[PDB]
């Protein structure tokens, strides 16, 4: 608990400490540390350092540094002095998958990555063609082009497009222009659903430059994607971690995480090395304006 800020590394502290509270992450990287015998070694070197310092505090209190991970990452991909948490999350998860594929537990693909379906349905013959893509997070809009809901926002992503009028979908089966529904659907799910909020903006011919949207969505606690699922399943997901940004740009600012333990049923708000605690009731009523607004939402299969 408590990740030392290394000079504008709150982007890395927030994402790593959310990763630390992921259902399968702890056990997975320990499994991979025993398989090997060098990002997975650095991950375990930090986790051991984190777990051991928690035990030292647990016995007798007095008044850990993710520096091990940073030096490994910089040798892995020298992007680094302050970046976006979303880009670094991809480089971490992507490289764990790149090594997992080269070794042959399928860690990253099972619990972060899901399967996406691009379905077109000719309304004249009702023949369904689908296209498969993989996805590890849901890019979601906040405002349109007041306080919109998250169901609306996911509906924007998993849109349905009705093809009627001068432009009709040509069905190869019907051999003729036809009316069609073109929809986006979720098939296979990961253990943790990441929601990436497009909460940044830009304008024209004054100031400045970029701008952040200081009006977040109505975030629910329960989440079911049955409405967009390829075949309605009763799986339900529960919010457990939220990364938030303070600032008016994407390049730099304060990144902070608010993770829930699943203290059972509470909120562990921690920033850099400065750790705090909050309640359930006075946190969801805190997101609406206000030093920061959310950027990433993580739900898990409860």
């Amino acid at each position: 608990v408590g990740l030392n800020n290394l000079g504008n590394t709150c982007y890395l502290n927030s994402i790593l400490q959310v990763l630390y509270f992921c259902p399968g992450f702890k056990s997975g990287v320990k499994h991979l540390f025993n398989i090997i015998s060098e990002l997975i070694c650095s991950l375990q070197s930090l986790i051991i350092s984190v777990e051991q310092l928690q035990a030292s505090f647990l016995l007798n209190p007095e008044k850990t540094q993710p520096r091990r991970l940073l030096n490994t990452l910089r040798e892995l991909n020298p992007m680094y002095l302050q970046h976006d948490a979303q880009e670094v999350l991809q480089c971490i998860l992507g490289n764990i998958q790149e090594t997992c594929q080269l070794l042959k537990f399928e860690l990253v693909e099972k619990l972060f990555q899901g399967q996406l379906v691009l379905r077109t349905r000719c309304l004249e013959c009702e023949s369904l063609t689908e296209r498969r893509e993989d996805f590890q997070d849901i890019s979601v809009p906040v405002q349109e082009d007041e306080m919109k809901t998250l169901r609306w926002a996911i509906s924007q992503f998993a849109s349905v497009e009705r093809i009627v009028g001068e432009d009709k979908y040509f069905c190869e089966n019907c051999h003729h222009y036809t009316e069609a529904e073109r929809s986006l659907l979720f098939d296979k799910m990961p253990e943790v659903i990441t929601i990436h909020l497009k909460c940044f903006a830009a304008s024209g011919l004054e100031f400045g430059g970029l701008s952040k949207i200081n009006t977040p969505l109505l975030t629910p606690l329960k989440l079911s994607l049955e409405e967009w699922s390829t075949k309605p399943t009763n799986d339900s997901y529960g919010l457990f971690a939220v990364v938030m940004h303070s600032g008016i740009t994407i390049s730099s600012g304060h990144y902070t995480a608010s993770v829930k333990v699943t203290y059972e049923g509470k909120w562990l708000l921690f920033d850099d090395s400065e750790v705090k605690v909050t309640e359930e009731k006075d946190f969801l009523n805190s997101l609406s304006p206000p030093t920061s607004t959310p950027y990433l939402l993580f739900y898990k299969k409860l």
């Binding site: 309304l123 009627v164 051999h175 003729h176 222009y177």
Partner: protein, 512 residues
Amino acid sequence: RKVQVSYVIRDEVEKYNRNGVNALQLDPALNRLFTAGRDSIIRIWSVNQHKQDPYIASMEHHTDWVNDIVLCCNGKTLISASSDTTVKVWNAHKGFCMSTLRTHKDYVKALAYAKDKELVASAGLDRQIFLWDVNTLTALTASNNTVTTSSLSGNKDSIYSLAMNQLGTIIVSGSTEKVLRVWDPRTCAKLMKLKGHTDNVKALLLNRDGTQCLSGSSDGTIRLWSLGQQRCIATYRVHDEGVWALQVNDAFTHVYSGGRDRKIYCTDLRNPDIRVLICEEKAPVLKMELDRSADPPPAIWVATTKSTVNKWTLKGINPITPLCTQPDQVIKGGASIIQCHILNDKRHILTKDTNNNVAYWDVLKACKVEDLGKVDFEDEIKKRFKMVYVPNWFSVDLKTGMLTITLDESDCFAAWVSAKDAGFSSPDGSDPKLNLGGLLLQALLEYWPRTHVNKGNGYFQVPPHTPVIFGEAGGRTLFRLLCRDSGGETESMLLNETVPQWVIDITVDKNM
């Protein structure tokens, strides 16, 4: 607004359907069956089990799928609905089109008929429903006085089905809005909104006094509605996939259903569990028409996506075993052209049809060159490959199942070739430069007197029966005639009114 020229490569008579059949009408006084072909042709058949060739006539005029047909006035009048956005009125005895209504703005999908009022209605993807007095429509000549129009509103999405009762007091529409909307056709008043289906509704029927309704839907259910109570009184899930076609006996007690799952059932409405599998067809069922010679109907005619039309007998009233295994009568169909390749000479086309037969065609002379049988299609393309480039100058479409060639001003004149390399011979034997699109246009209009300068193009003719169609890009057909007919006074008048200036330039003024 932009006018294209097209023509169809075909025989003078296409006795058999070249595509699936969208709708059926049975004339009980003459024992005649009408089929509405996806190939744009309506055909009249004799249902005498005597005759070996049941063909009587084809009724040619539509440019695209004919989606619905209604026989009116004891078989005197036929009304047709097509994906070319028009409704046409036919003399059903002589088989020619008398008038064309153009009030729709998208595919016209369904027609409805109130026998006691000689009332018909049309509906399509444009969400419009028009009501037409049949006797007003036939009353057209010289100054028609036109027709005053009437349409129904409320439909929020594209309409796929439509029914009226025999008395003409109730009209119901079915659409992708998943609700059936009901009006009184006499007053245009909205009556009720029937909710219950979770998908498109492609099949609708009303009882004689418009008090009950049967709907068939792509959600796989049949629903019975009471119009007096404005609610659903029974739901039937006898199919696996969407239900597309419904029939009911005269007593409104047995419903015949068919659809995407190829299976055709007869279900008793009073006792659902007693239901009979009549047959399993070879292709999705699009429409069915009971033979009503006798009270318990003796047979049902079935239209599918295949070009053949099967009559199934019912002489023998849950089920694994089909009641029937072979049709009782069979109207033979022809093959559809489903694949097309333009060769490198931009002159010949290789086709594959539904029989996996491969043929070779001459686009310039608008005719077939040789049948190649069941050779491999892609191996045949590479076998006739010649490393030569000729600019694209036409487009081909297979929407009717026959070869339709379309010319557009943008590239109609793009292909100059030498007479020698084009397989031609000229009187001076000079071998100057020929423009393919320009020669074809002159052959298509060879019989148009205004193009006659002492006549034709001097190198080849098209077959006189080739249909020549002038339409607007995206939708509206303007004028269709046969090549040989251009010398007529009606055709010459209509050509002067319809031939776009970019064709006049080449065919009349002889500019190039």
